[PDB]
């Protein structure tokens, strides 16, 4: 079984530099090269270099010629890739290949690194509340909006679970602010909106926050 | 510098399916080549190099071919599984570098959104900040256009959005909207506006309400 096993996530305020690294096991570490490619969110995969674990031959993407750094250690088989001023443009998941030459054969699960000035904080929870009385609609659009939060990410259930059809938790946006933000939604039957209570139960652990907010018709 | 460059960039089908991708090269890279399949979250797994050869692993079903500048990756019997993106790339000269990726989605009849608007809550406006969020919920196919329209007002800059990924059930998708504007700005207006374009809709449809008007 090859083995390639990166750092923990890391979290980089800007101008900082950054040390990840990747562990080989299940191999000769001397006789592959180790690549490494960068992804930002939603993007494609962008090669940095290349590096020959045998002596440290090293061959970087001129791109991230002042950005990448790559250096190894044969004795304990991981490669490093340092990182400078890291900024915005540098928060990416980066990847460690292998290859039996030319090709990528076996990958690390990867290292994200989140560049931010941002400091934890917990979110502010908003209503999505239902708004109409008519006999041509049946459901009704009602959720929550957890709002400007830091860093990822936000669990949301509703009802404790209960509810769980019809539920739609979208993919969190990093705002300006550089605060996260995320809403939540579940599309339900106008008839139980005064039989049926609904609550959106959101948790950010890393600022140990817990709240359920009751979201209720704004009659 | 070679560019890789695949088709399409989102393959729309059905299982079972024969599917082809292509990627084409900007020069000539022998058979330098390699297709990976990637799903959410995970990392890049190899398939084929070589140009054709299957990485030891891969499934029957996938199999590539070409030489010189054209590569086409193809896949026999697409599974419930084989739904996902895949890359292409080059390790012929340096920089290596990777096709922009194509997205193999599952096939459906087209299904307009069903859209809400939700005006800002008291709640928030207390701390003179305002966010408008539209829904466009469960449609099909994935393309929407999106805008808001304050005093019918075209707004820009000021809205982001977020997709959900295909659903697991009607394959359909969810997209979220937010107009953020301040406490005094957004009680400089009455009606607020959300005009959402899908071609399941003979028309623009909009979603709007009134400042203070239940």
């Known amino acids: 079984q090859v083995q390639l096993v990166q750092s923990g996530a890391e979290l980089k305020k800007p101008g900082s530099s950054v040390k990840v690294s990747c562990k080989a096991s299940?191999?000769?570490?001397?006789?592959?090269?180790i690549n490494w490619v960068k992804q930002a969110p939603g993007q494609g995969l962008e090669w940095i270099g290349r590096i020959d674990p045998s002596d440290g031959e090293v061959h970087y993407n001129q791109d991230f010629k002042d950005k990448a750094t790559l250096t190894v250690d044969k004795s304990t088989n991981t490669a490093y890739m340092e990182l400078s001023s890291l900024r915005s443009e540098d928060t990416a998941v980066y990847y460690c290949?292998?290859?039996?030459?030319?090709?990528?054969?076996?990958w690390g699960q990867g290292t994200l690194v989140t560049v931010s000035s941002a400091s934890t904080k917990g979110p502010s929870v908003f209503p999505l509340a239902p708004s109409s009385k008519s006999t041509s609609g049946g459901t009704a659009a009602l959720g929550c909006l957890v709002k400007d939060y830091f860093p990822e990410p936000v669990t949301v259930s509703w009802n404790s679970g209960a509810l769980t059809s019809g539920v739609h938790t979208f993919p969190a946006v990093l705002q300006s602010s550089g605060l996260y933000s995320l809403s939540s939604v579940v599309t339900v039957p106008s008839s139980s909106l005064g039989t049926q209570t609904y609550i959106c139960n959101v948790n950010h652990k890393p600022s140990n926050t817990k709240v359920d907010k009751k979201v209720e018709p704004k009659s | 510098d070679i560019q890789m460059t695949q088709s399409p960039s989102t393959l729309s089908a059905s299982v079972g399916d024969r599917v082809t991708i292509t990627c084409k090269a900007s020069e000539n890279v022998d058979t330098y080549v390699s297709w990976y399949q990637q799903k959410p979250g995970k990392a890049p797994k190899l398939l084929i190099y070589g140009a054709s050869n299957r990485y030891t692993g891969v499934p029957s079903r996938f199999s590539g071919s070409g030489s010189g500048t054209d590569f086409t990756l193809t896949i026999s019997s697409l599974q419930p599984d084989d739904f996902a993106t895949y890359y292409c790339?080059?390790?012929?000269?340096?920089?290596?570098?990777f096709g922009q990726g194509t997205k193999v989605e599952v096939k459906r009849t087209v299904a307009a959104p069903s859209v809400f608007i939700f005006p800002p809550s008291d709640e928030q406006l207390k701390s003179g900040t305002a966010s408008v969020v539209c829904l466009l919920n469960n449609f099909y196919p994935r393309e929407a256009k999106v805008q808001w329209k304050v005093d019918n007002a075209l707004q820009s800059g000021n809205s982001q959005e977020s997709v959900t990924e295909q659903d697991s059930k009607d394959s359909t998708y969810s997209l979220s909207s937010t107009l953020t504007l301040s406490k005094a700005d957004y009680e400089k207006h009455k009606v607020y506006a959300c005009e959402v374009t899908h071609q399941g809709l003979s028309s623009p449809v909009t979603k709007s309400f009134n400042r203070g008007e239940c």
């Open positions: 290949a292998r290859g039996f030459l030319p090709w990528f054969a076996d």
């Open positions: 299940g191999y000769i570490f001397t006789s592959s090269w």
């Open positions: 790339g080059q390790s012929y000269n340096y920089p290596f570098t």
